[PDB]
């Protein structure tokens, strides 16, 4: 078991940080106790009145997707060429 | 007549443009090109003749001849003219530009679309005819058919509308002819105490008949061509011709009427012949480009400017811009194999400016290269 | 008068060619060409070399420059090589109009 996770020791830290900063990123500032104070300030600002997943302006986002779409036409050009000049393609 | 257009539809684009008349300066043009709109001189000018006909590419062909053009001129600052109708490969190379450029991160070098398009095919030229230098001209952007009319590519950023002859019916193809030729005269500063030419080169994808006499003219203003293998009309026929090696007046002929049935004329088909037969007989200043075999534009373009350089002189200062072009390119073996072959003789100090390219832009193949030539 | 012919004539040689549906489609490809150069009358030779996976053959012979295709002729050639899973012929017919 400790041979198969530590081959992969990397990927899962990451994912382990990656799920960490998440959870922190949407916990309110102050620790429990205090946690109370903004538990009732989200309360009454609900009843009075992001960093990921944003909506981006139609011509921002456009742009976003025509550069990705080159930058795909080019791992995939780039691909093609490898293939062209490996061993078994020139045989 | 200098205005802006406002391109209403899809996406805004903005678009500067100049009326020019049949006997305007190419020198007044230039310089309102460079000066009054700031578009550096470019380091390669690749002119797009044909694709306006009836028949067009085949998918597969024009997105590989779009994707490579614009690749070949990302490297370095190229103007790309075509005749900037939407319409026909003109329309695909400008969205191709435009791609280029919503996904390009370096604005140092820039891929200009520059369109020489007819005052009398520009649809609702009356729209842009305003051209308030507070307020740019609004103009719609419609897909039309083959047709006789279209309106001006939102994808190119600048144009040209050259008016209508009275004399002759032919002012674009000539102005055309003039605005190349008077770039390929222009010799830009380099670096230090030094310049350079403006490589220029003609693409030829499925021609028609007509742009015979501008191809000749071209050939004769020593502008080097490159052609579509299968681009579908005069193309087919040149390629052709070339691989038989050998042409004659009646393989010639039998080709113009195989390929355009329509044309049917004995003057007209003599004139056909022997402006072909003028343009294989050049031959130096042509070049083929064949995407199942060559499939690199960018290895063409520079064989044939250098080619054409060859053909032209042997003096090592016009070999600068070509080198240039092989040093962005990465094309060492090809300026190995011509350009550093010993008919030219290469200089200590020619080659300053070229070795500061290379080091700066991370080129060791052709440092290395410098290095052993001198 | 039969080798006059001899564009409706092919030689399978076992020891050389190997694959018969190679040159059978071949054969009728030929045959087709020199009969007509319209896109309606390779309808079945393209099927065939869909069924066959011979994308090289049709790219060679049937997709060259003599032949005029379009949109309205592949769609449904199209759809036999969407369902029956001919990835490179869905990507010639995509390539090819
Ligand atoms: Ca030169
Ligand atoms: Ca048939």
Same mark, same amino acid.
């Given at each position: 078991?400790?041979?198969?996770?530590?081959?992969?020791?990397? /990927?899962?830290?990451?994912?382990?940080?990656?799920?960490? /900063?998440?959870?922190?990123?949407?916990?309110?500032?102050?620790?429990?106790?205090?946690? /109370?104070?903004?538990? /009732?300030?989200?309360?009454?600002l609900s009843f009075i009145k992001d960093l990921l997943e944003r909506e981006l302006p139609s011509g921002l986002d456009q742009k976003l997707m025509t550069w990705e779409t080159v930058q795909k036409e080019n791992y995939l050009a780039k691909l093609e060429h490898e293939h062209r000049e490996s061993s078994g393609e020139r045989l | 007549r200098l205005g802006d257009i406002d391109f209403t539809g899809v996406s805004r684009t903005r678009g500067k443009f100049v009326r020019v008349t049949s006997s305007t300066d190419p020198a007044e043009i230039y310089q309102i090109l460079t000066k009054q709109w700031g578009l550096a001189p470019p380091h390669l000018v690749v002119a797009l003749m044909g694709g306006d006909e009836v028949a067009q590419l085949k998918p597969w062909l024009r997105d590989t001849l779009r994707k490579g053009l614009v690749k070949a001129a990302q490297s370095t600052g190229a103007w790309i003219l075509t005749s900037g109708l939407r319409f026909g490969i003109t329309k695909n190379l400008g969205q191709a530009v435009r791609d280029h450029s919503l996904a390009s991160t370096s604005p140092k070098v820039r891929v200009v679309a520059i369109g020489i398009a007819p005052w009398n095919?520009?649809?609702?030229?009356?729209?842009?005819?305003?051209?308030?230098?507070?307020?740019?001209?609004?103009?719609?952007?419609?897909?039309?058919?083959?047709?006789?009319?279209?309106?001006?590519?939102?994808?190119?950023?600048?144009?040209?509308?050259?008016?209508?002859?009275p004399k002759r019916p032919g002012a674009t193809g000539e102005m055309r002819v003039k605005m190349l030729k008077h770039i390929s005269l222009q010799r830009t500063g380099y670096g230090g105490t030094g310049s350079i030419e403006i490589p220029v080169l003609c693409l030829l994808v499925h021609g028609e008949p007509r742009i015979l006499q501008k191809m000749y003219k071209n050939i004769q203003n020593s502008?080097?061509?490159?052609?579509?293998?299968?681009?579908?009309?005069?193309?087919?026929?040149?390629?052709?011709?070339?691989?038989?090696?050998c042409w004659d007046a009646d393989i010639v002929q039998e080709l113009l009427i195989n390929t355009f049935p329509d044309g049917l004329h004995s003057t007209e088909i003599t004139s056909w012949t022997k402006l072909i037969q003028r343009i294989l007989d050049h031959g130096h200043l042509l070049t083929v480009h064949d995407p199942e075999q060559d499939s690199e534009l960018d290895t063409v373009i520079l064989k044939a400017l250098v080619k054409a350089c060859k053909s032209q002189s042997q003096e090592a200062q016009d070999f600068l811009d070509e080198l240039k072009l092989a040093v962005a390119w990465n094309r060492v073996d090809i300026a190995k194999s011509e350009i550093f072959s010993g008919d030219v003789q290469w200089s200590a100090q020619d080659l300053e400016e070229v070795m500061m390219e290379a080091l700066v832009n991370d080129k060791p193949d052709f440092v290395r290269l410098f290095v052993d030539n001198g």
């Open positions: 078991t400790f041979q198969v996770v530590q081959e992969n020791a990397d /990927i899962f830290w990451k994912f382990q940080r990656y799920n960490l /900063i998440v959870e922190y990123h949407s916990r309110p500032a102050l620790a429990p106790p205090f946690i /109370i104070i903004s538990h /009732i300030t989200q309360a009454l | 095919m520009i649809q609702n030229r009356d729209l842009l005819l305003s051209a308030k230098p507070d307020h740019p001209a609004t103009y719609p952007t419609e897909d039309l058919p083959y047709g006789a009319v279209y309106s001006l590519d939102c994808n190119h950023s600048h144009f040209i509308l050259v008016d209508e002859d502008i080097p061509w490159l052609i579509l293998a299968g681009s579908g009309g005069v193309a087919d026929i040149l390629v052709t011709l070339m691989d038989r090696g």
